[PDB]
Amino acid sequence: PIGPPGPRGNRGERGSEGSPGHPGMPGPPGPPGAPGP
Amino acid sequence: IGPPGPRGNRGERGSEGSPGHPGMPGPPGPPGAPGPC
Amino acid sequence: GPPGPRGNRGERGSEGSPGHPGMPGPPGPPGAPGPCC
Numbered sequence: 001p002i003g004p005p006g007p008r009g010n011r012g013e014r015g016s017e018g019s020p021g022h023p024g025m026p027g028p029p030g031p032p033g034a035p036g037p
Numbered sequence: 038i039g040p041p042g043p044r045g046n047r048g049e050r051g052s053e054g055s056p057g058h059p060g061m062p063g064p065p066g067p068p069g070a071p072g073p074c
Numbered sequence: 075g076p077p078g079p080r081g082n083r084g085e086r087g088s089e090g091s092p093g094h095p096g097m098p099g100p101p102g103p104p105g106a107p108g109p110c111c
Contacts, residue, residue, distance in 0.1 A: 001039045003075030009048030015087030016054045022092075024063025027099025033072030036108025039075030046081045054090025062096045069105030 001075055003039050003042035004077050005043045006045035006078030006080050008046045009081035010083045011048050012051035012084035012086045014051045014054065016089050018054055018057030018090035019092045020058045021060035022095040023061045024096030025098040026064050027066030028101040029066050030069035030102030031104040032069045033105030033107050035072055036074045036110055041076045042078030044079050044081055048081060048084030050085040051087030053087045056091050057093030059094045060096035063099035065100045066102035068103045071106040072108035074108045074111035
């Protein structure tokens with residue numbers, strides 16, 4: 001009579017961390033310039 | 038005797054990876070409107 | 075009946091998803107001084 005099945009294998013390694021996200025949105029237009037001379 | 042039993046089951050696959058780090062900040066916005074007279 | 079062999083190690087988990095975009099960029103430089111009317 002055949003022997004019992006063998007034990008289950010080990011878990012695979014965790015998947016690697018993902019890529020970084022896209023860079024941010026460009027910022028707001030700057031302040032208004034000072035009045036002229 | 039008894040032949041050896043069956044090969045065990047395939048281990049469960051590892052857990053899926055983490056979401057990536059956030060991306061870098063976006064560039065500074067453009068210059069402001071030219072000032073008045 | 076002897077136990078069977080250990081199953082193979084499970085597969086590697088898949089690569090995690092990309093992260094969030096970066097934060098919006100800083101404001102720009104003040105605008106140029108006004109012209110000399």
